Amino acid sequence: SKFSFGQATPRTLLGIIRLSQALAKLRLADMVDIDDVEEALRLVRVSKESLYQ
Amino acid sequence: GGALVLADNGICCIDEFDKMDESDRTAIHEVMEQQTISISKAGINTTLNARTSILAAANPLYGRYNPRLSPLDNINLPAALLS
Amino acid sequence: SDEINELKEMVKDEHIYDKLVRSIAPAVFGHEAVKKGILLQMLGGVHKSTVEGIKLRGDINICVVGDPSTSKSQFLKYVVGFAPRSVYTSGKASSAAGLTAAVVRDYTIEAGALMLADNGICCIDEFDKMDISDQVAIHEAMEQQTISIAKAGIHATLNARTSILAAANPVGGRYNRKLSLRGNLNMTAPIMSRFDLFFVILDDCNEKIDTELASHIVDLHMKRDEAIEPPFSAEQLRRYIKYARTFKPILTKEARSYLVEKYKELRKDDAQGFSRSSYRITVRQLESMIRLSEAIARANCVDEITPSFIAEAYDLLRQSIIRVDVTYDKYVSMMNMIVRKIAEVDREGAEELTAVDIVDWYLLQKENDLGSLAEYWEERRLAFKVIKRLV
Amino acid sequence: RVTLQEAPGTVPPGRLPRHREVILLADLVDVSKPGEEVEVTGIYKNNYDGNLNAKNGFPVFATIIEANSIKRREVFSWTEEEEREFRKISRDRGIIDKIISSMAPSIYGHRDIKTAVACSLFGGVPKNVNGKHSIRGDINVLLLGDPGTAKSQILKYVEKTAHRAVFATGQGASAVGLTAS
Amino acid sequence: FDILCVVRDLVDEEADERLATFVVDSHVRSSPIPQELLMKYIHYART
Amino acid sequence: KVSDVDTSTIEQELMQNKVDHNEVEEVRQITDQDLAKIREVAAREDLYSLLARSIAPSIYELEDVKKGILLQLFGGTNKTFTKGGRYRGDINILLCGDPSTSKSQILQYVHKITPRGVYTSGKGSSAVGLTAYITRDVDTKQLVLESGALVLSDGGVCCIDEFDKMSDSTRSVLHEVMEQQTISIAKAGIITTLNARSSILASANPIPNLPVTENIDLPPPLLSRFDLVYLVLDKVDEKNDRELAKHLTNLYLEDKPEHISQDDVLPVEFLTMYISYAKEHIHPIITEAAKTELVRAYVGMRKATTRQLESMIRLAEAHAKMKLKNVVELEDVQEAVRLIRSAIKDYAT
């Protein structure tokens, strides 16, 4: 109830790998460094969670 | 074709994403398997390739986002699609 | 000669009816209704006379309805297995004719489907799948009794006198107990009213019966024991029946007078409420009781029958009805309210509660019929009088 | 020029009603009216190709009857002993009720719904007012039935009894199909 | 349509008795004018 | 011009024949000491688990799917009665869920193992296509009968893509097969009822909460007919996706392919000769032992349709077919139910 959406189904994982792999490309990368992935998580959590304001 | 086929390999954009009724939502629900639409009707057996990206602007259930309601209540959309 | 002794041995006994019933469909487990439903098609009425004029029916019809997995199809397969002159189709794919003749072009005629089984039992699965086109044709078969065929060539008329056993799945494949059967089966009215009667089955969980099913089915899939056997062998029951077909059962008997009151006993209690299984009960049901009677006469070899057999056909129709259930005119309207409220509340509740409420919602309903204040005041004082008398 | 088609009653089965052109002259004009059978003595004529030569394949002449004259066409019954007998029966008043009771035997029916049948089946008076309008001489019975009521069977009686009685059903159809075409 | 015949209706013992006896009588089997003379009568009078 | 080892019962005559005029090859033959290895491995307790991990080496977790299919490979026991009967061994499995769940990969794998199976996509299919083409031969300019796709698939496993998406006229073929276990062709030239006895493994893509029974689409009567219906759902694993990602994100590296699931004990060619052996040399019977628990399961579910019972007694006998038991234990019907209940622990949402 409230909070959610669950369940964070694997498409969110694959999604965040894919976002990661996107952010890498603006670094032009091939490395795909940790700050990239972390950043993807950031965008994800910031997306929602604005419903607490 | 139009829309999805017309714009593919590139971004497709949708407004009023709630009012689209039903048959449309099935198309879009399927296109996230990418690489597909399948038209079995009448003179068409083809399965064409849509490489489309989708951006969808939608309004929460009327009037605006009632906080006394849980999320997924004020979002009218099924969980099959949001995943 | 050697066999006729056996036939005699069959007609002598008082149980061979029950033997018939129990021995019909070994594969199937119980239900006891559709057993009779199946056999009484094999043995038909007089289907003759009354001239001048138009001829009576005669024969019989049944449509089995129920939630799938109820093995309604096993009956069917058993009939196409057992009795000669029986065609089996699964239509939806009929497709059209199918149940009628082409005609082949010449003017040589295809058999085919329905008509090639004549004076017999045609078995169709799923009326609900064949849509409009052919159902009308079937109606033409069960109304006019004749099949008229004219295509781009020689005009024709070909008789088919047949019984039609169908198995029809409900709209949602389920009940819908609360819904009228009229609304559930989803076939058009005229073809509906020609099928008497339906013998609806629904399966519900009962641990005794459940255990019996699992036991019985596992039994079936076991080569041992296949020793389960009917009191009659599948081979003899045919020569028996064919013997029983050679009779011209006719009831002159004035105990037929009784039948009238029986017809009469049937509709009265079923008049109010209309929210019961009605139907009507249609005169065609009076007309149905006849062919049913003669059917049971065929069964028991008895001629001119008994009022008792009449009562059997009667009760049969009764359960077939109940399965579908789920100046004092003023006092009548209130008594109707009492029976209506209780009958609904007993089926969907215990019924009890505040007696005042009954008057409350009653006034709320009858307020629509109130032409003048005197009608309100009368209805109020009457309902009050009944409750005061009732107490 | 009038097109004469062969009479529909006399057509041998499986054959279309072929027809020929007819040429009237002088007084024969206007003697004919559409819908009517007509007896003509005219001589037969051809000329002159006339015009096909495109879709035939052959030198084929037209067929035209030049007309000469015009003329209009061209198991149970009552009987003397039977009618002289008969008359004495119709004299009692109660014959009406007896007839109604006789009108639909096997239904058991009603006294009313059969009464209507008897009434309309039996007749009326046409009846033309000089010279304009005939009103109507018939009784049109709407028999409004009810599932399970006899409403079908009754009218079926009428097909057996009446002299000229036709069963068109609803449509779909049991020939004939109710619309002249 | 001049004459409208409505049919009903709520069950009556005489109406249902009387009918059922007749129908049953019919199916079991297997004052008014003879049909032939009436079907002549009508034609006669109309002519 | 135009447009694993086989079973014995199915072979039948070609054993009963081909001996007389003799011949060579046919049924796969096994040496002695390797047999001595099978009868040893059967002893291993984790076997029922073990084989389940060995089926799909690339594919991670979702063990009960691997497992149900494992029983699809052992499915049922064939019965002729006096005559007729013929319920075969056939067990049929639909599975649906979120996309990219490997649901197609399994199809590929089963397709690879199963000797006679045939693989069909949705919409690339038609009721004429699945049996009896009656094509012109064009070599002799004659009319010759061709076997449809289900007739070929007779024995072993038919695999189906995108089953939800089949045209309405199609699926009307399956109500014939699933029940009768034969197909009845009265059309055109030749009129006969010909036998296709085949498992079906169907993939489905659905359109929390909502009726699930609604959300698979399908007519519910057809949907109830399938023996074991898998619904992919989160197992709450965390704790899984990491392991699975270790599996898939490899290859990756090393670029060369070595092992895969290692370090995990796995059979390779052994499991096929095992499976074969199990199938030909074993014919399990429930005896007095199944029926009690067997029924009480069905009731427990009823508290659905009778098919679910048929299901249990067939599916279970596969379990018992494995482990080399001629008779079912009262035990082993437990998980045999649980597999049906497995999807229910996935129907909670």
- F263, F275, F295: which is closest to F57 by C-alpha? F263
Distance from CA of A7 to the nearest CA of B (A): 9
Residue B51 vs residues B1, B48, B56, F204: alpha-carbon distances, Å: 14, 10, 16, 22
The set of chains that have 3 or more CB pairs under 8 A with E is: C, D
Q: What technique determined this structure? A: cryo-EM
Please tell me whether residue F201 adopts helix, strand or coil conformation. strand
Amino acid at F77: T
Q: What is the DSSP letter of F136?
A: B
Core vs surface per residue F283-308: b (16+ CB within 10 A) or e: ebbbeebbbebbbbbbbebbeebbbb
- Of C297, D157, C299, nearest to E30 by C-alpha is C297
**What distance in Å separates the CA atoms of residue E1 and residue F259, rounded to the nearest whole number?**
92
Q: Put residue C338 in one of left, alpha, beta given phi > 0 → left and psi -120 to 50 → alpha.
A: alpha
* Cα-based distances in Å from C349 to C342, C343, C344, C353: 9, 9, 8, 11
What is the per-residue burial (b if ≥16 Cβ within 10 Å, else e) of C284-321?
A: bbbbbbbbbbbbbbbbbbeeebbbebbebbbebbeebb
One-letter identity of residue E38: L
Per-residue three-class SS string for chain C: CCHHHHHHHHHHCCCHHHHHHHHCCCCCCCCCHHHHHHHHHHCCCCCCCCCCCCCCCCCCEEEEECCCCCCHHHHHHHHHHHCCCCCEECCCCCCCCCCCCCCECCCECCCCHHHHCCCCEEEEECHHHCCCHHHHHHHHHHHCCEEEEECCCCEEEEECCCEEEEEECCCCCCCCCCCCHHHHCCCCHHHHCCCCCCCCCCCCCCHHHHHHHHHHHHHHCCCCCCCCCCCCCCCHHHHHHHHHCCCCCCCCCCCHHHHHHHHHHHHHCCCCCCCCCCCCCCHHHHHHHHHHHHHHHHHHCCCCCCHHHHHHHHHHHHHHHHCCCCCCHHHHHHHHHHHHHHHHHHHCCCCCCCHHHHHHHHHHHHCCCCCCHHHHHHHHHHHHHHHHHHC
**What is the C-alpha R_g of chain A?**
13
Q: Which of E19, E21, E35 sits opposite C257 (nearest CB)?
A: E21
Which of E20, E25, E35 is opposite residue C264, by nearest beta carbon?
Answer: E20
Q: Which of C72, C67, C199 is nearest to C124 (CA)?
A: C72
Task: Say what angle helices D151-161 and E35-46 make with each other, to 10 degrees.
Answer: 70
Question: What is the layout of strands, in order, in the sheet containing C88-89?
Answer: C61-65, C163-168, C121-125, C88-89
CB atoms within 10 A of CB F132: 22
Cα F11 to Cα C149, F26, F35, F151, F154: the distances in Å are 49, 10, 23, 15, 11
Here the tokens at position E28 are: 């079991």
Is there an interface between C and E (3+ Cβ pairs < 8 A)? yes
Dig out the tokens for B54 from the structure: 């989708």
Breaks (C-N over 2.5 A) in chain E follow: 30
Distance CA C164, CA C61 (A): 6
Compute the radius of gyration of chain D from its Cα atoms: 26
Whole-angstrom distance, CA of residue A52 vs CA of residue A28: 35
Resolution of the PDB structure in angstroms: 4.8
Residue F285 in 3-state DSSP?
A: strand
Angle at B26 between CA B20 and CA B29, to 5 degrees: 100
In angstroms, the first-to-last Cα distance of chain D is: 24
At F349, the amino acid letter reads T
Taking the C-alpha atoms of residue D68 and residue D24, their distance in angstroms, rounded to an integer, is 7
Amino acid at C336: N
The two structure tokens encoding residue C262: 């029986």
Are F100 and A10 within 8 A, CB to CB?
A: yes
Chain D residues close to E22, C-beta within 8 Å: 106-108
Regarding chains B and D, contact by 3 or more CB pairs under 8 A is answered as no
Q: Label residues F103-130 b or e (16+ Cβ within 10 Å = b).
A: beebbebbbebbebbbbbbbbebebeeb
Residue of D nearest to E2 (CA): D140
Counting one residue from chain C and one from chain E, the pairs whose CB atoms sit within 8 A come to 63
Q: Which H or E element spans position F229? A: strand F228-231
Contacts of E22 (CB under 8 A, 6+ apart): D106, D107, D108
**C-D Cβ pairs (cutoff 8 Å, strict):** 25
Burial C189-217 (b: 16+ CB within 10 A, else e): eebbebbbbbbbbebeeeeeebbebbeeb
Beta bridge partners of C61: C164
Between CA C164 and CA C63 the distance in angstroms is 8
**Touch C-A: 3+ C-beta pairs under 8 A:** no
What three-state secondary structure class fits F36? helix
Q: For F230, phi and psi rounded to 5 degrees? A: -90, 135
Question: In Å, how far are B22, C31, D132, D135 from D128, measured between CA atoms?
Answer: 66, 70, 7, 7
Give how far Cα B8 sits from Cα of B27, B53, C167, E20, Å: 14, 7, 50, 76
Taking CA–CA distances from B41, the nearest residue in chain F reads F167
**D90: nearest Cα among C62, E37, B44:** E37
Closest chain D residue to the Cα of E17, Cα to Cα: D108
- Cβ distance F302 to C210 under 8 Å? yes
Interface touch B38/F205, C-beta < 8 Å = no
Q: What angle do CA C349, C351, C356 make, to 5 degrees?
A: 140
Nearest residue of B to residue A8, measured between CA atoms: B83
- Position F229, amino acid: V
Nearest to C286 among E23, E29, E30 (CB): E23
Hey, are the CB atoms on C53 and D150 less than 8 Å from each other? Answer: no
Distance of CA F123 to the CA centre of its chain: 22
Residue F128 to residue F148: CA distance in whole angstroms? 8
SS3 F302: helix
Name the phi and psi angles at C63, rounded to 5.
-130, 110
Residue F85 is labelled as binding a ligand: no
The Cβ of residue C158 has, within 10 Å, a number of other Cβ atoms equal to: 14
CA dihedral sign of residues F163, F168, F173, F178: positive
DSSP state of D166: -
Distance from the Cα of F208 to chain A's closest Cα (Å) equals: 8
The CB density around residue D100, as the number of other CB atoms within 10 Å, is 19
Could you give the CA distance from residue C184 to residue C177 in angstroms, rounded to a whole number?
A: 9
At C376, list the tokens.
Answer: 């309100």
Residue of C46, C126, C131 whose CA lies nearest to C89? C126
- Sorted by where each starts, the structural domains of chain C and their CATH numbers stand as 1-326 (3.40.50.300)
Task: Say which DSSP state B35 is in.
Answer: S
Spell out the residues 6+ positions from residue F286 whose beta carbon is closer than 8 angstroms to its own: C218, F294, F313, F316, F317, F320, F327, F328
F183: left (phi over 0), alpha (psi -120 to 50) or beta: beta
CB neighbours of residue C97 within 10 Å: 20
Yes or no, beta carbons of D106 and C50 under 8 Å apart: yes
If DSSP codes are grouped into helix, strand and coil, which group holds residue D49?
coil
- Listed in sequence order, the residues at least 6 apart from A18 whose beta carbon sits closer than 8 Å to its beta carbon are none
Closest CA to D114 of E22, E34, E3, C49: E3
Q: Which residue has the tokens 């399956």?
A: F174
Instruction: Judge contact between F319 and F337, C-beta under 8 A.
Output: no
User: What whole-number distance in Å separates Cα of residue A47 and Cα of residue A39?
Assistant: 12
- Could you tell me what percentage of chain E is helix, strand and coil, using 3-state DSSP and rounding each to the nearest 5? 60, 10, 30
Contacts of C223 in chain F (CB under 8 A): 79-82, 85
Query: Residues of B with CB below 8 A from A5's CB?
Result: 71-72, 79, 82
Angle of helix F47-55 versus helix F63-74 axis, rounded to 10: 100
For residue F215, the one-letter residue type is: N
| Angle (deg, nearest 10), helices F63-74 and F270-281 | 50
Q: Do F165 and B38 touch (CB under 8 A)?
A: yes
Question: Strand C146-150 to strand C155-159: parallel, antiparallel, or no bridges (unpaired)?
Answer: antiparallel
C88 has which bridge partners? C123
Bridge partner list, C205? none
Q: F234 and A11 in contact by Cβ < 8 A?
A: no
Residues C283, C291: Cα–Cα separation, whole Å: 13
Integer CA distances (angstroms), C391 to C355, C358, C361, C363, F71, in order: 10, 14, 20, 20, 68
Q: What is the CA radius of gyration of chain F?
A: 21
**Residues contributing to the annotated binding site of D:** 145-152
